[PDB]
Amino acid sequence: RGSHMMDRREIQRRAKELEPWVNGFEFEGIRYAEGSDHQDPADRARAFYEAFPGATRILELGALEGADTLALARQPGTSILGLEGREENLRRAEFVMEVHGATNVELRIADVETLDFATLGRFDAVLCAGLLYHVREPWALLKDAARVSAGIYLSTHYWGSSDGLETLDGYSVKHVREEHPEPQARGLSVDVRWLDRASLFAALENAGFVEIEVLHERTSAEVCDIVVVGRAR
């Protein structure tokens, strides 16, 4: 066993100490931990780098257990900063990076609703998946991405109706208590706001992402799903 490898005994001990996992943990064909009741990272990374082939410095928001972070880091020559709001999730992600020897990744605790994004430097693109519907002011998160980058890969839900919605900063919003079924995926505020489709596209435009490419969309009168690439000047 190469000197760069963590001992399997220690992989086992630490993976157990880190339970419960959200997406589980497997390494060398050994399933150490199972995930919870609630895209494949390699496929997401492929789509991300189809959109941003020249990217060498990436910001990932809401890194969870580091699965996308690791997939994005496979290519040498690209460095990733992953931000995660829940310390318990971050500790998992840090363990994953250590087990895999992913030295081109940095992980940091951060609350995207309060962080000063101007402290982070510049990125070729921002990955923002599974996060926009966990914040109070989603338009502001999009503005923060634009402060540091000209590209965003955004995967989010939006709300399929405009009827009866509230209005904040001119956007139509569904304002609800944060009750996402996976507790370890929840936002850091008691509440969240979802956007209707028009307000999501307006918020992208108003942040500066004036060119929007839709990669995937599933519509309903209620929960909708979308993946878009936003590009700013």
Ligand SMILES: Nc1ncnc2c1ncn2[C@@H]1O[C@H](CSCC[C@H](N)C(=O)O)[C@@H](O)[C@H]1O
């Ligand atoms: N305000 C906030 N600041 C930073 N991270 C947050 C946050 N609100 C939620 N998160 C984190 O964002 C993640 C949401 S689940 C999405 C995980 C991953 N991006 C994916 O697409 O599969 C969780 O790890 C959660 O703890």
